[PDB]
Design a protein around this ligand. Structure first.
Ligand SMILES: Nc1ncnc2c1nc(Cl)n2[C@@H]1O[C@H](CO)[C@@H](O)[C@H]1O
Length: 385
């Protein structure tokens, strides 16, 4: 029953996703708001702890006590220059507990501090409860994914987050490996198969090259930009619309925190529409000083606004190929991961770089990792019996 069942969890930097492999198919499980992915956010309020959508939905009202990006801290020492650099950009406090970072917040009127693995365990507990509500019984066996570049300390702290969350961690697997499993790229028989995973998420960009030799995965190269993602594209749209508001009304809105946030969420929505329509409409009632902001933007203008950022995704692709010592024609498969890979210009740039090659994109790119983890969790629990 429950003991013969296992889930696959993609514990992402900005969003998490849970899947289950049963009756010959993967089911990506929708949360209680009907969303197939859940924000990796934890909010501490005057009455409760919120996780996911409810936590992301109140971030503007409570920024000091809304934790996100715990994955950037997990398994790291406080003195790590990655931690010291990131801390300057977060509205929540990060403290030092014997060279270990803790996020410090106000919860039910009291000061509380949490280890990154404790924050990530709250996200994991939510994914576990989302699976349980779908299945009708508690599932505790899980495969959790991590970036291919995570070291032993980061992998161990992720497993620790799983244990705190009440999960039996069957295995910690690499995100690009789970994506290759999702597409069945490890079941092509004999011979070395070279796979490139192009993973453009909400806040990070990862390029991974894997060799699959008779079911055995080997990481040949990892490249990317830990501070490049979908939110930089939302921000480029924001600056455009702030300048358009100034041209139409002779008013600078950039200082009004509420106006900028409402514009930001509307820009994120319009960006998604631009992946399947050649125009998107913004409809903001009373954006600033009672002025409605009803406008539109073409996909051509959005592509211009992010042109330099889209083009920059090809430098880590070339870097990974040189590190792996492979030419473009030596790569057998190209896999898309992350919601931002739905952007047509991004697909076109990658396909043209690989000389007109087909891309593996039929599985929802923001779900491909959880899909593969779910497949592996099923194989692993069946072998355990
Ligand atoms: N249809 C889409 N077109 C463009 N960007 C998209 C799309 N869907 C998502 Cl999710 N994202 C973005 O992916 C990230 C999460 O993986 C977020 O930045 C989200 O906006």
């Amino acid at each position: 029953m429950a003991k013969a069942a296992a889930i696959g969890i993609d514990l992402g930097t900005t969003y998490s996703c849970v899947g289950v492999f049963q009756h010959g198919k993967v089911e990506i499980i929708a949360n209680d708001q009907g969303n197939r992915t859940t924000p990796s956010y934890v909010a501490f309020t005057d009455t409760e702890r919120l996780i996911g959508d409810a936590a992301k939905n109140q971030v503007a009202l409570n920024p000091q006590n809304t934790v996100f990006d715990a994955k950037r801290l997990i398994g790291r020492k406080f003195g790590d220059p990655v931690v010291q650099s990131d801390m300057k950009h977060w509205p929540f406090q990060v403290i030092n507990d014997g060279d270990k970072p803790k996020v410090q917040v106000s919860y039910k009127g009291e000061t509380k501090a949490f280890y990154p693995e404790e924050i990530s365990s709250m996200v994991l507990t939510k994914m576990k409860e989302i699976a349980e509500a779908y299945l009708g019984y508690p599932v505790t066996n899980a495969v959790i994914t991590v970036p291919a570049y995570f070291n032993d300390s980061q992998r161990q702290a992720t497993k620790d987050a799983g244990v705190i969350a009440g999960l039996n961690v069957l295995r910690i697997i690499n995100e690009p490996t789970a994506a290759a499993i999702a597409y069945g790229l490890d079941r092509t028989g004999k011979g070395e198969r070279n796979v490139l995973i192009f993973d453009l998420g909400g806040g990070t960009f990862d390029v991974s090259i894997l060799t699959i030799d008779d079911g055995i995965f080997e990481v040949k190269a990892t490249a990317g930009d830990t501070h490049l993602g979908g939110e930089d594209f939302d921000n480029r749209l924001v600056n455009h619309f702030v300048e358009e508001f100034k041209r139409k009304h002779k008013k600078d809105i950039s200082q009004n925190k509420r106006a900028v946030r409402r514009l930001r969420t509307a820009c994120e929505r319009a960006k998604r529409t631009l992946s399947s329509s050649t125009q998107a409409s913004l409809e903001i009632d009373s954006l600033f000083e009672g002025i409605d902001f009803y406008t539109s933007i073409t996909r051509a203008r959005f592509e211009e606004l992010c042109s330099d950022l889209f083009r920059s995704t090809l430098e880590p692709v070339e870097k990974a190929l040189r590190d792996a010592k492979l030419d473009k024609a030596q790569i057998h498969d190209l896999v898309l991961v992350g919601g931002s890979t739905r952007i047509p210009k991004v697909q076109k740039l990658l396909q043209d770089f690989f000389n007109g090659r087909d891309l593996n994109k039929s599985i929802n790119p923001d779900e491909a990792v959880a899909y593969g983890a779910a497949v592996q969790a099923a194989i692993l629990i069946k072998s355990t019996r």
